[model samples]
Target chain A: EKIPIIVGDYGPMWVYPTSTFDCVVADPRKGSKMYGLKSYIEYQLTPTNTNRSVNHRYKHFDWLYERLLVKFGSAIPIPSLPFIKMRMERLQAWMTRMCRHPVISESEVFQQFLNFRDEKEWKTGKRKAERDELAGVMIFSTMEPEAPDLDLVEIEQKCEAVGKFTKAMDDGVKELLTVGQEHWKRCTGPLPKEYQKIGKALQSLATVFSSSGYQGETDLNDAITEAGKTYEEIASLVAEQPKKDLHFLMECNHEYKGFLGCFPDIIGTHKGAIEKVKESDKLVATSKITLQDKQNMVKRVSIMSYALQAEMNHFHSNRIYDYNSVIRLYLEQQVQFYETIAEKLRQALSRFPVM
Target chain B: EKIPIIVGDYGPMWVYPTSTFDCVVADPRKGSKMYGLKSYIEYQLTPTNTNRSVNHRYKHFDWLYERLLVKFGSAIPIPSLPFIKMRMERLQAWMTRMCRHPVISESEVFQQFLNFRDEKEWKTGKRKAERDELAGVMIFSTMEPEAPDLDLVEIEQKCEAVGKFTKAMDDGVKELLTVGQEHWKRCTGPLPKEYQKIGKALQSLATVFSSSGYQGETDLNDAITEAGKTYEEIASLVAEQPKKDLHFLMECNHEYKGFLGCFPDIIGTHKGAIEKVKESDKLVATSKITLQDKQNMVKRVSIMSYALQAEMNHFHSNRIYDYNSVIRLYLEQQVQFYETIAEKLRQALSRFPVM
Candidate 1:
């Protein structure tokens, strides 16, 4: 309550409702359930839209990933389930983010994967997805043009800005990941140990004070002993905080680190389309490609750019939402963490004989 | 000021001006002087009673120790100049303590060692001390008894009390010594390293705040950055505190650790005298020791016990003086150190945009 609320400008831009799906991933059971002689963690996926939830392992998720690649390919960035133990909230959003993709959402394989049941019957859906012809080079040919445009210049600028933003965001998140992981190790290990060592010293010191055959030292002896106990408690608090505070933050960092990696590829596809529009000049000069054909290519590039702009808008809105909450959650936890220590330390200070 | 003044009952004892000498040992020049092709630290000794100051190396001090042991033997505990690098204040008190010993103050070698201008002439004093005719089994024969007549019961009780106090006090001092040394090492090493690592994390976290392309983040950025700097400062403070706070405590711990060890041996001597009085029973039965002879022996034992009681009173007075100052110094520095961090941290907290 002492600090500003840290609310962000989550203004809506022209885009489809991105967070449409509600999917919860939980109840991870580690066993040799599906694969013989091999242990794995299988998580239950329960989508709000589906009547029956499905139980799936990493292998099933990997299969769905391959199908999504074959169907949507570079048309849009896909969501992650890359053998990572992510926060449940992340995977839920991950599911929503996957569904937000225009082409991927419409895929036959994607439809069955989330609400899929009876494992062997999934083969037919996979068979159709893998054998499908409209993957890779032909992926963009299938996308519908819904964007209204006046000039190509505006499109390029928006694309460039988003590309820059995503790249920088990736790098920024990477630093937090490195720092968080290190902090986790230290809090659980050395940092707490240091506090523990100090606590032990104070404990023994209290013993010395009591051992002293001097009267009126009893108060000091009592205070030092309590201070020792508080410090040891501080050690345990220090050790356990990563789980309470940093674990989810770090889980998000790892997920985003991986999620952000896929965006460059999506951006690459858009860049390639723009390059195609530019390379058409050579084709037009040879009379093999007319000016009308070049114009069509430009129009097609505009379509791709429009979709790219929509994705960027989606990303920005989520960026504001995701980061503000993550940071808010983090700072909130940290404030409480520090406040606890402050109280404990203040109590410790007060417990002593003050001058 | 928070603690009691620790004013001890320094009632008048039979101890003859224990803290009589005013001596300063300083200006240690490192070089090879008397010993060819050898390097050692030589200190200058300036005693107030002598007009001339003396330059003596550890070798010279060692020679003095050998001479002292030969002349006085276990008759009195001598002061330390053990090749250990002791604090100057300790050495000054050490000099005074040595002079406080009735037999040691009369040593010609000790007198010259402190004020010797011509270093080589020390050999004559050393020769007399090492080959002294009053050394060994004939040691107590030449002693003068100034103690008044006392009952054998009271004498034995006083001796036992002194002995018990000294033994337990040594063990207690040893505990503090261990704790102080450990605290010193931690302040100078791994504990500071832990704080440094946290400081570095906060430093980079500030970088992250700046990287976030959000408006109104400037306040958080600035606050976090400064907090990072202050944490770094805390690291330096943590590292350097050994010298400022714990170093002196540890030094005193070491000095007292050594000093306390010597008392056990002194107690042993008193115990040995009591044992001799007990063993005189057979002599008394043989008529070789008449009733009057036994009475004389008892009187001699009384003199020894009276001296032991005087030494214990002296120890108690000095113990109160030394510990009060040491503990007071430690708590004062600790309070300042913590108050600095608290102010800095509170300042950093306020710097952030509060609602």
Candidate 2:
């Protein structure tokens, strides 16, 4: 149902397993709804899964994250809250990732979190999720694989491969963020100041020239004045060029950096599972534990692996779409930025031709 | 003859008083072809006024400068050599300035320096100028005026105005060199380096992206690679942009700054003339000096003023032409530079459109 084959051409590149849905967090309003004594910032989240909007405080997202981690930690990694411009963007992206996740998208607690409009029902579901016995390692029991007799060797190798890629990606994203953010900072701050300072210096020089009271040089004066003003204008344009798209780019990199941060712990959890199965193998052979006990332990690890492998496939696909779209977006802005500046400078030159 | 009005429109903005002519110093060749014992840099000067070419060593120019300074010491300012890129430009500009002056342009020593091709005649003229008794204050005897009388009060006022203008111009030009040279340094060196650093970072990031082995992202990788290459290309363009025109701008500013530097001493010499005239007034009243002797001193000071005033007019006109032409040339280069970069960046964007 997720993959659609075309005669030759494709339409949308991706769709959720449960059906395409989006949750957007916006308009952070700070107010005490319960009483004026306690203050909070409430974000409006519109989840198309429910086709409804809800106002949730930061703590509500935090609580949902804790519940999801407790439930899905045995399978896929549950994204933790990561700390722009990206205030709403970061949260909205987090929600989108959570909603798009194959297992997480279908979670009863998440569905309840989005669907419950009544405070009583909200409190009820929140309490139920906090105390849910069918969470942690027990949640692995629910996973069912379509393909029978999955190979343990290949599953372990896939997890190892994912681990290596995640480690490499982490370093890559960290470097990308550092360089991109540093460049962005200069584009808006020191770089613009440098251009602006030149403009002021040129303008002041023109004032000195004007005071010299020379004839047949009014055109020169006008050109220089226009040149000074153009540079100052460019300073402003240079500052805003990033805003056209690069701000969103930084947000994308920041989110991915944080997303990659979750992998070590998820991979660690799987390592612990393999270790537990190996422990059972030694104990059963030494006659310290029953043979049936080793079988159950092996089966439990397989279920968790099945769920992890499914998510691993989805994660790679999601990663590809996001980076492709965002990088292209960044390129678009940069091209527009340079072209705009060059055109303006060209026009400025034409204004005073060899006078 | 100096200022010509067209039938309706102007043809040339300016023409030399001794008929239009130019002295171009070029191809500074270092050698000692005479004996290969004393190494020297010989500059070739082709003066249209003489309609001949002469190769002279730096010391020969220095000797000619000394002769002119002594001969025109009380009459008008004799240009001293000021120290590119400007090696040839500096010397050429100096020669041109000397050839354009009302009094120095007509001096026999300067004419000999340009026109004397035979070694014997060159040496003969050099010896004659060095020992000429009709130099210093006595050079005023060569002058003839069409006017019946000269006004001393107005001449004094004009000299004061010239002194004040030179002081202001010196400050203006010095400040111009500081800012323009600093900007040029950044454009060629630090600014280009910054741009190059960004290009390297982006290209390296693209390398990281390429190694990630993601699908549907080759286009993004291509775009980022193109983007990096474009920035690096821009770095080179920025470096050379100044070379295309701004180097000459700095040279023009440098020459003018040095040109302004001479005015203080030139004005000081005029002040000495006024003091001498006042001294004669006091002595003649006491009968220590005769009335005829006082008249001779007054007439000498008046001749110096006439030459100085004519030069003052030329200096303003030359200043206007140089600044106006150089600034426009600078603007032209900047426009072309910006336009070229912008087009490249725009093309880079179009290479990987929203894929």
Candidate 3:
């Protein structure tokens, strides 16, 4: 009721469609007057989140970054728009040649896919298990479990430590804020200027990450529907390829599909754009790949699904520890400042009324 | 456009914001007709100062904290509400008593005014001159007129040396935040519950640091408004007992007020509260038996204020010295984290897309 959930309630720490405490007001009067004071306080409310258009455009770019991180383990810097245009022209030419070559047979395609499958599983799966294990150990022991022995100095030290660290985490977030703002400034304007420089820069980064080589957020989602096409041509020729190669291709597909498990809230942020892009594959590759190809493509797409998850690690660790520390420090400072004031008052009061 | 202006216009970095890209398009033909693309891309937005309510709140608090520090070297622990409350109340009580006493003569009041005026000018002028001298030669000389040749590592080492001794200025603040938080948890709903507790505690403290002893914020402001009435009463009492303990009273007021001026901003938060409390003549009497009556009171406040100012000494020194070393360390760690992310992306590009 208070903010999609009651305070002190055992609710999930994270909630998408995030609801947070917005503000507060204290008055000398209480009860109905305080309750009715909502109108008075309403004027104080500031926008909780940035406006929709700004965030929508901004977050979509962020999503792309995540997608790339998931697939490639890293992504190239945004190429100049001219570079993307040249790269795309070359890729298109290669695709045209690839479509007619005898080596482009189904059997050859299947063998190549098998190689991609093995690469996906080995790189991503191994790292995640290690991270989860660490996360488990960290949360095992909670602070303030039942409160601790408190001498004034002990309490004071603990509070200072907390405040210090919270500030540290706050400082860390500045970089992320810049990543969004800089891109917007660089890419907003007219046609080629907009599309070539801005659009192509964005497209090339997305394409590189979304390629079979990497796992980026935008790439993973977009790759899902056409994922089968990546494998269908190969599967058809599998009869002529070695079974080992076919097996390898299947595993790559498996890795891609494995990533579909990204938690709903995380992906929901990009759902609108994901829907828009999913339709493009159907029209362009209509006769190029088969149903089985679509199934195989899911595996490649899944490999990049966990990109968002890994990037999130930047925030969830000692940063939280540091923030908790600062808040505690701030609290302690407040109490002591007043305590000194109070002791001063006691002394003065002794001399008062008579003085 | 930017707050707390950076030294130069171009110093603002861009790569910080626009780091990602994504594509949205299903069918090449449809995408081309509508958007001319099988995939359309976008960049991620970065976060800024306006992202959250707490940020704005923190900004206001920091502004107030800085102002108070400049006004009073290390008198109290920044601008927490408790200090303000207690200071306001005690100041009022002392001023009221002074008005009702026998010191009601204008001549007596004028004599006291002359002493106060001379003391204020001499003390402030001397301290400022010393500061200017130090600024030119001691440590921060390099930051102005010319960039210091000192490396970052050297700056950090210097800060560590100073930070070792001066942290106690914030001891009161550290304790206050802890007590405030505890009080809030015990009291009930709302973040402001803690804020309110600080207010009450401050009022309580101010009662002790009143004019009968030394000067406090409230007592000084009150001196301006209630001087006529209180001086009249003092004149009568002094005439009755020419050798009475009147000097003792004057001494106390001088010492207490002097201490308060030394370090007003310990936490460096709460600008609004500090301004409001400072405006009230009743708020300054929170210090106990002025330095004139009790040397210990003067020494204690002086040491504490020095500790707080010590934090800022880093900036004055034009080096990374740490009076509040903990906060500096925290900020440094954050900067490192962001840079690391940028570095990792650079590595990724080299591995995946580089020729």
Report the number of the highest-DockQ candidate.
Answer: 2
Q: Write the per-residue lDDT of candidate 1 for residues A1-355, one digit (tens) a residue.
A: 0100111233212334345655667664532244333356666776666756676666777787777766554645566663254445555666666766544555667777775567676676667667878776465565554435425676677668767767776776786677667657867886777667666666666675455466766766676677668778988998998877677667666766766787777778777777777789987887778998888788767666655655554555555455445544554566667667766766765656543
Q: DockQ of candidates 1 onward, in order?
A: 0.10, 0.39, 0.01
- What's each prediction's clash count? 0, 1, 132
**lDDT score of model 3?**
0.27
Candidate 2 lDDT tens digits, B123-179: 999898889887766766776543443567866876787787778767767766776
Ranked by DockQ, the better of candidates 1 and 2 is 2
TM-score, each model? 0.65, 0.83, 0.16
The TM-score, computed over Cα atoms with residue i paired to residue i, of candidate 2 is 0.83
Residues A1-355, model 3: lDDT tens digits? 0111111222112122323312111121332223333322211111223211111112322332343233322201111110433333433332222222211211222112212234465345334433332121122111111212233343333334323332332232232223322322222321113112222222232233233222323423243212223223222322223222222222222222222223232334323223323543683477565656554333222221222222232223222333233323333332343233333323322321210
Top lDDT model: 2
Better of 2 and 3 by lDDT: 2
Would you list the C-alpha lDDT of every candidate in the order shown?
Answer: 0.62, 0.70, 0.27
Fnat, model by model in order, equals 0.04, 0.38, 0.00
In CAPRI terms, model 3 is classed as incorrect
Q: How many backbone clashes does candidate 1 have?
A: 0
What's the residue-level lDDT of B52 in candidate 3?
A: 14
